[PDB]
Structure formats: C-alpha cells, structure tokens
C-alpha cells in the first residue's frame, strides 16, 4: 500500500505544516501537524477542557464506532518551546492520503497548554520519530508508520514541505519526479530515538565549505534551524547590522537585509537553503527587525534540521531494519 497527502503551511511563515488526517468510523478529519521529532499522535477532543479549545477541530471518539478507550492508559508529553498536552488514548482507524492503519492509539487531549490553543490552525500532532519515545503508560503504543510500515510498498516516508506552499508527505514509496538530482542517503542514529544523522558541514552564501561534522535530528516539527553557535556566528556575521538579541532570543536582521542562503551537507551531497527561507519576518508587528531563521542550538543541547532546512530538500526517512535518511535537492 501507499498514500499520499499534501501538506500546507499554517500561516505566512511557514511556522508548521498541516496535513488532513481521516480518524474513526465515519471519519472525522483533522489537520495534523506531521512531527519527525516525536512520536505521538494526540488530537484535540470532546474531552479537552473547553476553555483551553478556541477554534480547532476536536476528535469525538463516542461518535467513532471504531473507537475503543485503551483501559488505563494516558499520556502526557512536553516539547522543546515549553509546550505539553497530555489525556486518555483510544484506537481507532487512522488515514492518510488513503493509506489506512486499524488500530492506531490516538491520543485525546484532556489538558493542551496555552500555545496549542492560541493556534486555531493545528488540530493535534503525528508523531514520525521512533516509537521508543511514545509516552503512553503503562504501555507505550506504536507510531501511525510503525503500524503501517509492514503493509507499505517499501518501508518509507518522505516530506516534501514547500517555502510559502503546499508539499507533500508520501507513505511507502519515493516520488522519482519529486526532486532533481540524486537522494542521498546518510547513516541515522536511533539512540535518541529521533532520525538522527551527521551532517558533512556548511557554507554561508557563497563561501568555501566548511568540512565538519554536525550532529542534529531531522524534525518536520521544528521551525527553524539550530545549528552550533560558532556556525550560526558565522551565517549572521554576513548579514551586515544582524545581531544576537537576549531579548528577543536569538539573532534578528534589519528587515531590510537581503540574507545569504546556507549549504548543508549530506555525505558529499548539498542542499542550499535559499537566503529568503531563513527570514522569519518582524519580531512584532510593525517592526523593521526581523527575527532569523538559523539559530544557535547552545541552549537546547542537540542540534535541529528543521523546517527550514528540510523544505530545501525532498527527504526520505527510510524505515528499513537499519534506517537510513536520504536528501535531494528539487
Ligand atoms: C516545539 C516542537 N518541536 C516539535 N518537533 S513539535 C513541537 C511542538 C509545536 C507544535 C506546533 C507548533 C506551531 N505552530 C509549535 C511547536
């Protein structure tokens, strides 16, 4: 089996991706945010406190006759922004883009954080990492690939997230058309339990690459890219008038900049992240400083390719007994 579904920006700068996911019987369709970097898939639900939903589409899984409560089981997750939700967990039937996993735990919020509600657009969260950090007790439960992923055509996905436009996230085959070129694939690290992997280095606009390595996750649900300080010190020194803000919290541009692109390496591969991706537009309304799109890891302690480095790439998380990732340019 396959499937296939376009993925959409949530707002203008790309800050998450939304894609259509079909839960229960008859379906009740969801925008999901598509997480690489975890392993969850939780919505918003008849069962989440009412002041804390605004806007988004709930899950009701009493109107489900595929839904079936998973006795004694919750969940509660955290993420990297200060984020959390937590609740109770059904199975259900779980679609995307026509592929269909029976059986999934889905995961009803009963409590979300500010955040979540302030943002109409996001209706809940896929998780793609490995399913060693789903956070189900007593029994941790599988992703939506995990499940899938013995039914697939090949055990893959890919994401094919746009600049200011809609992409895609295939299930178990690769789109040959989707991206120039050759993929390149590159050793992955499950130890985390994230698609992790080394990249091979950088280079800021047209400069020499830099040789070495950098070790970070590719992660779908991360905006930006977090890179070491000294790589990032290295990108906004060529951005004349860019400076590291406490704060703000992190480096911002004048508005009126024109950023270089920033090349990452893939083995001996590149991918060029284009300067006008790594602008994330005024810090506030109205402002002429702007707010950047690379930024240093030194905080988080793991290094992140996020979406601004994965939409410059076609990217193949590649869920064979030993993962691999693969990246194209397109
Ligand atoms: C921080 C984080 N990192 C991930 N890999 S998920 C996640 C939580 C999250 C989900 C949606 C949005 C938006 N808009 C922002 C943050």
Same mark, same amino acid.
């Given at each position: 089996s396959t499937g296939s579904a376009t993925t959409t920006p949530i707002d203008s700068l790309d800050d998450a991706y939304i894609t259509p996911v079909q839960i229960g019987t008859p379906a009740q369709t969801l925008n999901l945010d598509?997480?690489?970097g975890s392993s969850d898939l939780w919505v918003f639900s008849s069962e989440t406190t009412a002041s804390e939903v605004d806007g988004q589409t709930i899950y009701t899984p009493?109107?489900?006759?595929t839904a079936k409560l998973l006795s004694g089981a919750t969940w509660s997750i955290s993420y990297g922004d200060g984020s959390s939700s937590s609740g109770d967990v059904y199975t259900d039937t779980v679609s995307v883009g026509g592929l269909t996993v029976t059986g999934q735990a889905v995961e009803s919020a009963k409590k979300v954080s500010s955040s979540f509600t302030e943002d109409?657009?996001?209706?809940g969260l896929l998780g793609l990492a490995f399913s060693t950090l789903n956070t189900v007790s007593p029994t941790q439960q599988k992703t939506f690939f995990d499940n899938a992923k013995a039914s697939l055509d090949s055990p893959v996905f890919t994401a094919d997230l746009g600049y200011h436009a809609p992409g895609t996230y295939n299930f178990?085959? *690769?789109? @040959?058309?989707?991206?120039?070129?050759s993929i390149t694939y590159t050793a992955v690290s499950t130890k985390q339990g994230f698609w992790e992997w080394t990249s091979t280095g950088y280079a800021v606009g047209s400069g020499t690459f830099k040789s070495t390595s950098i070790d970070g996750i590719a992660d779908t649900g991360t905006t930006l890219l977090y890179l070491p300080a000294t790589v990032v010190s290295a990108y906004w020194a060529?951005?004349?008038?860019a400076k590291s803000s406490s704060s703000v919290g992190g480096y911002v541009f004048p508005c009126s900049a024109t950023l270089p692109s920033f090349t990452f390496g893939v083995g001996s591969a590149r991918i060029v992240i284009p300067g006008d991706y790594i602008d994330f537009g005024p *810090?506030? @309304?109205?402002?002429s400083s702007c707010f950047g799109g690379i930024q240093s890891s030194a905080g988080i302690g793991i290094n992140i390719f996020g979406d601004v480095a994965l939409k410059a790439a076609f990217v193949v998380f590649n869920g064979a007994t030993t993962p691999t990732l693969g990246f194209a340019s397109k």
């Open positions: 598509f997480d690489t009493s109107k489900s006759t109409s657009t996001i209706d178990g085959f *690769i789109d @040959t058309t989707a991206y120039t070129g060529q951005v004349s008038g *810090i506030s @309304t109205g402002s």
